Amino acid sequence: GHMGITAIALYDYQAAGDDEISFDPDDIITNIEMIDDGWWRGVCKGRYGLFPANYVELRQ
Ligand SMILES: [Mg+2]
Helix, strand or coil: CCCCCCCECCCCCCCCCCCCCCCCCCEEEEEEEEECCEEEEEEEECCEEEEEHHHHCCCC
C-alpha cells in the first residue's frame, strides 16, 4: 500500500558507497524518489539510499 513508486531490479548492483544500496536481479525497490535522471533513491531489503535508475524497471 504505502510503498510509493516501486520497481524491479533488472541487474545486479553493488553499492559503491554507504549512500548507495545493493540489489540482485528481480529484487523489489520501493519508496522511489527520482532525485535526478541518472540516480534515484529508494528502499530495497531494508536498506535506504541511491542506485542507478537504468538498473531497474518501474512497476505499472
Ligand atoms: Mg548481488
